[PDB]
């Protein structure tokens, strides 16, 4: 399914960060990604001879890890019938962790989609970097920012915005020198401005060209007072590139905010991007907040209560978040219940106690909130919208409003409506 696919993209992102985080105290793990074409017999041959060699490495801890890891992966493939289709991930090792845990480890899996790596790595940590590279599939979009003040170059992923380079040039200004020069000032100044244009042009060729062929997918030129148009129409600007001029964008003051505005003018050009869909959705959500219609709902305290009652058209959530619900549980009455506690009251506080009875009150195995939405969103009837916290609106709503909220089915004025 498609919705389950997107759940795997975030789920895989979260799993990968862990596989990358685990560490050895002073030892090496074998990571072995086997590709789909090979035969098991051939793998057992290549490795059994590499095995008779690994038989005589000098170190004790490394040697035993290699030799024991080779026997383990063979036993894991003894579990695998054939090199399975579309890849084979394998991760054997001896990971130490906090609390002093000399832990042996074996993590074997058929991959979900085709995987290309033919990894072999006796190393301190595991590697699903292949998985995240496989997950992040969208082209990078460069941005050139020009101004009489100074330049700036920056790229643009699906959600993430990056900055590549920026610089200055001391182009002396219009007043320059009066009487004698003023009449021939605009001509000399246009030459000098064009020389600045040559330098900007050179940077765009450097960046956006790749062997007279663009490697990055899009290129958004940008400037004010017709800086970008000279860059577009200039002959230094490459013809194969004129074929692919995606857009030129005007800005004010000249810079990063203007870089952001030029992205806002782009919006319709980056329709495929979730960042653009987010910009448009959160643009409507702020239109709801501006208007009195009272569709908005906000905060986990109110939004989760609002979700429970229903009423929720769009539930805007950051894909990671890391906020939790403390499920309390009793012995006798069997009343499981969730509680949303602030940073002060959650960490150091005496509210998880029965007190009346005279006991300390526990909680039971929690669950992720986003995985819970994906599990039972059709039950509630709410449009889950996956946002990051990188973008100006997503990062903002993420920091202040818990990276969660929603457009409601109807009006609920909170200042009007006590309770």
């Amino acid at each position: 399914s498609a919705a389950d696919r997107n759940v795997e993209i975030w789920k895989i992102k979260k799993l990968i960060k862990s596989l990358e985080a685990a560490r050895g105290n002073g030892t090496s793990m074998i990571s072995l990604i086997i590709p789909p074409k090979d035969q098991i017999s051939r793998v057992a041959k290549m490795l059994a001879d590499e095995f008779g060699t690994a038989s005589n490495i000098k170190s004790r801890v490394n040697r035993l890890s290699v030799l024991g890891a080779i026997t383990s992966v063979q036993q894991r493939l003894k579990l695998y019938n054939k090199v399975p289709p579309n890849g084979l991930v394998v991760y054997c090792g001896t990971i130490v962790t906090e609390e002093g845990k000399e832990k042996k480890v074996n993590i074997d899996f058929e991959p979900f989609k085709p995987i290309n790596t033919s990894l072999y790595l006796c190393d301190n940590k595991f590697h699903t970097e292949a998985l995240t590279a496989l997950l992040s599939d969208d082209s990078k979009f460069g941005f050139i920012v020009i101004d009489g003040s100074g330049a700036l170059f920056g790229t643009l992923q699906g959600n993430t915005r990056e900055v590549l380079h920026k610089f200055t040039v001391d182009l002396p200004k219009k007043h320059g020198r009066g009487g004698q020069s003023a009449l021939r000032f605009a001509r000399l100044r246009m030459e000098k401005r064009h020389n600045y244009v040559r330098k900007v042009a050179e940077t765009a060729v450097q960046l956006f060209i790749s062997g007279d062929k663009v490697n990055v997918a899009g290129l958004v030129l940008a400037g004010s007072a017709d800086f970008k148009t000279e860059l577009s129409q200039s002959d230094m600007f490459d013809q194969r590139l004129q074929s692919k001029v995606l857009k030129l964008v005007d800005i004010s003051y000249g810079g990063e905010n203007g870089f952001n505005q030029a992205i806002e003018l782009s919006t319709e050009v980056l329709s495929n991007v979730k960042f653009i869909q987010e910009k448009k959705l959160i643009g409507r959500y702020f239109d709801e907040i501006s208007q009195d219609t009272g569709k908005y709902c906000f905060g986990v305290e109110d939004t989760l209560k609002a979700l429970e009652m229903g009423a929720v058209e769009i539930l805007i959530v950051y894909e990671n978040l890391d906020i939790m619900r403390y499920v309390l549980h009793c012995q006798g009455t069997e009343e499981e219940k969730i509680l949303y506690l602030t940073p002060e009251q959650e960490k150091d506080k005496s509210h998880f106690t029965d007190k009346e009875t005279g006991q300390e009150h526990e909680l039971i195995e929690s669950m992720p909130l986003l995985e819970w939405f994906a599990n039972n969103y059709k039950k509630f009837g709410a449009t889950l919208e996956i946002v990051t916290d990188k973008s100006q609106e997503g990062s903002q709503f993420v920091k202040g409003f818990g990276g969660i909220g929603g457009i409601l089915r109807y009006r609920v004025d909170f200042q009007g409506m006590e309770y």
């Binding site: 002396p172 020198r177 004010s252 990063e256 505005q261 906000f298």
Partner: protein
């Protein structure tokens, strides 16, 4: 009429000797480097050592035309022409101001201000960017935290932290520029302090600069 009314009107702050300052408007090379700007504070006795701000370079001013006349001394509050013998030349900004080398002027990355929001118009959540306008100085800026709302008429500022603010509500807010930048106080210099909020074809807000974080 207008110019006769100026003749009958002497009501203007001369801007008199204080800690010497000179905000730099623009620059160019004509056998050196001339720059323009209104002396918001203090004096500058041409053959004398200045320092710029906030990047902080020592610098001697080669020549001046008080608007259109060669002079040695000058009091503040005047559109001055100032040609420098720059040791630092190409990483100077239009906007970095000269100050006294001893009586330095504050400048700072973090600062608080009472902003009166005219037209964002969207909600102004923590972390929006614009440009910060300080008469000659001008840097791109972001606001990290949003302290609180305040009324326009009879302004008694509230206790509890608000969750958001809509288009018009006035508020006290902290503004972080990208780089180092010339900021003054409303008490010390309002001429040095009153600043702008800026993005698209939309005026965001007026700003009221209060603090200078070092």
């Amino acid at each position: 009429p207008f110019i006769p009314y100026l003749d009958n009107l002497p009501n203007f702050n001369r801007s008199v000797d204080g800690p010497i300052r000179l905000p730099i408007v623009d620059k160019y090379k004509d056998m050196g480097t001339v720059v323009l700007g209104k002396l918001e504070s203090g004096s500058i006795c041409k053959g004398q050592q200045l320092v710029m701000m906030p990047n902080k370079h020592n610098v001697e001013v080669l020549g001046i035309l008080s608007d259109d006349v060669e002079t040695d001394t000058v009091a503040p509050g005047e559109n001055l022409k100032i040609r420098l013998k720059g040791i630092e030349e190409e990483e100077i900004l239009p906007g970095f101001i000269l100050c006294d080398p001893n009586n330095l002027c504050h400048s700072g990355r973090t600062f608080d201000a009472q902003i009166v929001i005219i037209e964002h118009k969207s909600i102004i959540c923590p972390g929006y960017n614009a440009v910060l306008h300080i008469h000659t100085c001008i840097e791109e800026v972001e606001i990290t935290a949003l302290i609180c709302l305040v009324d326009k008429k009879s302004g008694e500022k509230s206790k509890t932290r608000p969750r958001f603010v809509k288009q018009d509500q006035v508020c006290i807010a902290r503004l972080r520029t990208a780089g180092t930048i010339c900021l003054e106080t409303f008490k010390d210099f309002p001429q040095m302090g009153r600043f702008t909020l800026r993005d698209e074809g939309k005026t965001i807000a007026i700003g009221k600069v209060l603090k200078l974080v070092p």
